[model samples]
Target: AGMKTIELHITLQPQVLDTQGQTLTRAVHDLGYAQVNDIRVGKVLYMTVDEVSDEKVHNIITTLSEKLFANTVIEEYSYKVLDDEKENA
Candidate 1:
């Protein structure tokens, strides 16, 4: 059987402040990396599944995003499919 891979990227809304990103930016500056600015941190979820229709993939991704991945009010998410390999490392 073949496999399909999904790549989910979650990020804070533009109006939402990311304290963690801010903290990390400050730390980087303290460490002498002052060139970094507008730092934004986000999450990436990678999953492999058995062959499924595109509609099915969309349904599952939408459901999970609404229920767990993103807060409807403060975050947004986008996803794409990645090339699948015969085996995983």
Candidate 2:
């Protein structure tokens, strides 16, 4: 048997102004934390599969990220497989 692993991390583009981040920053400041200047939030996903190559996984994830999971005009994503060991290490 074989194993496959995948990970996905998504974030807003640098140019996009994250209003939620800004609001959170203000809230924290109101709560007495003034040193924080900026805040950003996004999404992360983790999955595991079987009998898939890296290239195939990349293509599948990239397509999903662009077409469904993200707004390409204002967001970006990067992903990596954290573990691939099939048997006991």
Candidate 3:
């Protein structure tokens, strides 16, 4: 392996209210899609780096998520390494 691609998503805690999601939900209702349920919003991040071990990747992403990408008190994050064969642009 030469390079690793990581995909991360950060989102507000379930207990937190998402105003953006609320607004979108309302708009969707106005559009007559009443059956459409709630909508939640979040952030997605991607990075490419030199090949690293799975544990290293986990540690790095977790640190980044906890210390930078998300607010530990109000948000949560999850990430995954893209399979080499599916590492598409």
Candidate 4:
């Protein structure tokens, strides 16, 4: 369909307590990488979207994130559009 891929990164707001992040920091240090600091934990979503203009895609993304992908009460979200690889790691 010649569609594209958009990657969305969702994260908790700074004001929120990130226990997972703290745990990750400790784990990294335990692995002998004390230099690693401020470890943050978040989620990534990859989506396939129909071919459309930039504004339309941006609007759709905003709607999706604000409506359900993120909980504004304790978390905030941001997203970016990426080129489709025809893939993820």
TM-score of each: 0.29, 0.28, 0.27, 0.28
Error of 3 at 75 (Å): 2.4
Could you tally the backbone clashes for each prediction? 0, 0, 0, 0
Cα RMSD, each candidate: 13.7, 14.7, 13.9, 13.3
Query: How do the residues 1-89 of candidate 3 rate in per-residue lDDT, one tens digit apiece?
Result: 11123455434423223222244346534433233334333333243433256634422243333343344465544446533222111
Candidate 1 structure, TM-score to reference: 0.29
Compose the digit string of candidate 1's lDDT tens values, residues 1-89. Answer: 01113445435523223222344355534433233334443343243433256643422243333443344565454556533211110
- Candidate 1 regions exceeding 4 Å error are 1-4, 12-46, 50-60, 81-89
Show the colliding residue pairs in model 1: none
Q: Looking at model 2, which ten-residue stretch has the lowest summed lDDT?
A: 80-89
Predict model 4's lDDT versus the native. 0.35
Q: Write the per-residue lDDT of candidate 2 for residues 34-53, one digit (tens) a residue.
A: 33334333333233332256
lDDT of 4 by residue, 22-66 (tens): 443455344332333453433433334432565334222433333
Q: After superposition, which runs of candidate 4 have C-alpha atoms over 4 Å from their true positions?
A: 1-48, 51-55, 58-60, 78-89
